[PDB]
Ligand binder design. Structure first.
Ligand SMILES: CC(=O)OC[C@H](NCc1c(COP(=O)(O)O)cnc(C)c1O)C(=O)O
Length: 382
């Protein structure tokens, strides 16, 4: 029998660790889930289900229910694209678009692009962890309270916006080398902003954020470590690739993307590999000495990418290559992607060249719009 999952979302604040994820892998692999006699007594299974994009739980004794009956596949978008609030627009205004590139790759590698700039607040994939995180604070953190984090830019803009929609004030911390929008848009959205012109990176900022949190009592939401990040991509980004492939009738063979927190690629890799372990995951490694906005090398220490049972393949990419791929994509598709998108595309194109890859459809995740990167565009034009 089917029940509305929303009555059981206390399990999100309750359940700790990664054990539940074996329930999620199992249900995804099987296409079904067993009826729960006493749903309350199985917080971890319930959590696994929410995590996969279900809106109903199976309830009763003996039966089971399909991913479809569970709502993994519900259409959320109103056909007329009319939303009663910005938040509902974030929620229901999904999936982001999966678009086939006109770009040709060797060895029968067919590229689609998932355009994450189609999120309303930061015009980036960071909208998703910002909503999911803040949403959870919402129940036990007092309105009016200040929340804060290190950001490369995207996260901070997104967070600043979502926090205000929720009653919170916001503070964002950025390295000197971050984009100017990251430093300026939060203020517009009414957050405070701190720029450390010294910090050679986002992560380098975490110590001062933590200390400051201890001192000032603000809540440090920590995207780098907060599981509402990966869970947000599991139920959004990753479910969507799954659903978009099955329904777009793609013969899905792999995904490609970049890594900052590592949240979205981890979810996409995890979720899809549960459905078929042969699904590849091609990941970018900014060539050492190079900086590609929003992303970094794998061994700089990332939570989920390392900690979960995920198969993946690294490729290096310079700033110069990532940009040449912005230009390639701009000229084929008339889509202006950002540097991490460029890199992700290039990583996919390198692996294509080596003949590493089973030929088929490959979904590349584009984190944001190239519009935000005009002086790198300027540099890439020489
Ligand atoms: C350095 C860092 O991790 O910045 C994190 C946020 N940017 C995310 C981001 C990514 C990577 O997605 P994820 O963090 O692995 O899930 C890729 N490209 C861009 C342009 C991004 O902004 C942040 O903004 O703080």
């Amino acid at each position: 029998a089917l029940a509305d999952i929303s009555g059981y979302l206390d399990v999100l604040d309750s359940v700790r660790g990664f054990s539940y994820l074996e329930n999620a892998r199992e249900v995804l692999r099987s296409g079904e889930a067993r009826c729960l006699g006493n749903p309350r007594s199985e917080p971890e299974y319930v959590k696994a289900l929410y995590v996969i994009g279900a809106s109903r739980i199976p309830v009763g004794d003996g039966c089971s229910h399909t991913l479809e009956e569970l709502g993994v596949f519900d259409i959320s978008v109103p056909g007329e694209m009319v939303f009663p609030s910005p938040l509902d627009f974030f929620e229901r205004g999904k999936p982001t678009p999966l678009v086939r590139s006109r770009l040709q790759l060797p060895n029968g590698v067919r590229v689609w692009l998932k355009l994450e700039w189609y999120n309303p607040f930061s015009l980036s994939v960071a909208d998703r962890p910002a909503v999911e995180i803040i949403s959870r604070l919402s129940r036990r953190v007092e309105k009016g309270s200040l929340v804060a984090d290190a950001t490369s830019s995207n996260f901070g803009v997104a967070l600043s916006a979502v926090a205000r929609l929720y009653g919170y004030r916001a503070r964002v911390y950025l390295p000197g080398a971050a984009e100017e929008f990251g430093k300026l848009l939060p203020r517009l959205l009414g957050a405070q902003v701190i720029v450390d012109p010294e910090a050679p990176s986002t992560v380098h900022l975490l110590p001062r954020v933590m200390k400051d949190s201890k001192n000032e009592g603000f809540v440090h939401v920590n995207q780098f470590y907060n599981d509402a990040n990966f869970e947000a991509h599991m139920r959004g980004t990753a479910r969507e690739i799954f659903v978009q492939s099955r329904r777009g009738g793609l013969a899905l063979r792999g995904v490609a993307g970049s890594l900052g927190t590592s949240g979205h690629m981890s979810a996409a890799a995890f979720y899809l590999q549960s459905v078929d372990p042969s699904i590849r995951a091609v990941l970018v490694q900014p060539a050492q000495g190079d900086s590609i906005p929003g992303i970094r090398r794998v061994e700089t220490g990332m939570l989920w990418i390392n900690m979960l049972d995920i198969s993946y393949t690294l490729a290096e990419v310079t700033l110069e290559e990532a940009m040449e791929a912005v230009v390639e994509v701009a000229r084929s598709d008339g889509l202006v992607i950002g540097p991490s998108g460029g890199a992700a595309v290039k990583a996919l194109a390198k692996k294509a060249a080596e003949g590493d890859l089973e030929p088929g459809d490959y979904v590349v995740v584009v984190p944001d719009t190239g519009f935000k990167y005009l002086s790198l565009v300027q540099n890439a034009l020489e």
